[PDB]
Ligand binder design. Structure first.
Ligand SMILES: CCCCCCO[C@@H]1O[C@H](CO)[C@H](O)[C@H](N)[C@H]1O[C@@H]1O[C@@H](C)[C@@H](O)[C@@H](O)[C@@H]1O
Ligand SMILES: O=c1ccn([C@@H]2O[C@H](COP(=O)(O)OP(=O)(O)O)[C@@H](O)[C@H]2O)c(=O)[nH]1
Ligand SMILES: [Hg+2]
Ligand SMILES: [Hg+2]
Ligand SMILES: [Hg+2]
Ligand SMILES: [Hg+2]
Ligand SMILES: [Hg+2]
Ligand SMILES: [Mn+2]
Length: 264
């Protein structure tokens, strides 16, 4: 909307690829976010001029409340630093949520298990992630777009036939062996509030239909997420840098950074 100010940075090289080891754009022209593909200074300017507010949602039920401290502490160090952030912690143990110190312009709401309409009036984007994780490096506005999915660290190099999609035609999450772009994680997705609510509403209805027909998708919510993103292409896809497990997968050369990881 508003003009960017004068900025001094390296000129992009038309005849020099960003990365020659990985795919950086999908066949529907959605960028695949890898380190080296974006200039964060330009993106930060663009989103700050919009006074962007990002909502980060996590569920912490039962024993999972134990992961909140590290999750929030590291998010304060690496998640959208500099931008407005609103944390939404859904838990069955409100009094168990740790008292974490937040930077200015960032807030946290504890919701005991809220109106879906509230999201529309409080944030511009919603980022939904698993709580038994920790941020280890930058996770910023480069991920913001109408709808995004993240490449599962265990299948990013696999062929579609190897993807663990739901293969039973009786399930609404059914995806045949000759279909599929990528295998997306259920633990890290997001986009505009409108698109995220459309995705979760679609998933909710599809799972209800499956339940009625007495069937449960092989990987539950994640199976439906994959069906949704197959039929509604994400406008950005995040590389495995955004959700990794160093204990189980190490640190491959293809990953210049490990940004969000599983907690042992
Ligand atoms: C992080 C590397 C994990 C590779 C092992 C297979 O990971 C599982 O993949 C299926 C889909 O085929 C589901 O997505 C499971 N939820 C995955 O395992 C669980 O989540 C991954 C990220 C790991 O944290 C693993 O330890 C969990 O069991
Ligand atoms: O009793 C439970 C089970 C799961 N979760 C949430 O569901 C996410 C996914 O579950 P889990 O960690 O068990 O799955 P994994 O990533 O190991 O496949 C977790 O990160 C939690 O945020 C929760 O809050 N309470
Ligand atoms: Hg580049
Ligand atoms: Hg969400
Ligand atoms: Hg989530
Ligand atoms: Hg669902
Ligand atoms: Hg879903
Ligand atoms: Mn998890």
């Amino acid at each position: 909307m508003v003009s960017l100010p004068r900025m001094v940075y390296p000129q992009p090289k038309v005849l020099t690829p960003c990365r020659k080891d990985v795919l950086v754009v999908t066949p529907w022209l959605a960028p695949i976010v890898w380190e080296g593909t974006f200039n964060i200074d330009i993106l930060n300017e663009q989103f700050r001029l919009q006074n962007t507010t990002i909502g980060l949602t996590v569920f912490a039920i039962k024993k999972y409340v134990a992961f909140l401290k590290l999750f929030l502490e590291t998010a304060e160090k690496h998640f959208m630093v500099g931008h407005r952030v609103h944390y939404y912690v859904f838990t069955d143990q409100p009094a168990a949520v740790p008292r974490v110190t937040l930077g200015t312009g960032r807030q946290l709401s504890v919701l005991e298990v809220f109106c879906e309409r509230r999201f529309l009036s409080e944030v511009d984007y919603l980022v939904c992630v698993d709580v038994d994780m920790e941020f280890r490096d930058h996770v910023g506005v480069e991920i913001l777009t109408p709808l995004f999915g993240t490449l599962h660290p265990g299948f990013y190099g696999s062929s579609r036939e190897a993807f663990t999609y739901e293969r039973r035609p009786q399930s609404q999450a059914y995806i045949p062996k000759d279909e599929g772009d990528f295998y997306y994680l259920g633990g890290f997705f997001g986009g505009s509030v409108q698109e995220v609510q459309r995705l979760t509403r679609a998933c909710h209805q599809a799972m209800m239909v499956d339940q009625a027909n007495g069937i449960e998708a092989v990987w539950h919510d994640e199976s439906h997420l994959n069906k949704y993103l197959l039929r509604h292409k994400p406008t950005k896809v995040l590389s495995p840098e955004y959700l990794w497990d160093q204990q189980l997968l190490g640190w491959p050369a293809v990953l210049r950074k490990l940004r969000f990881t599983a907690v042992p």
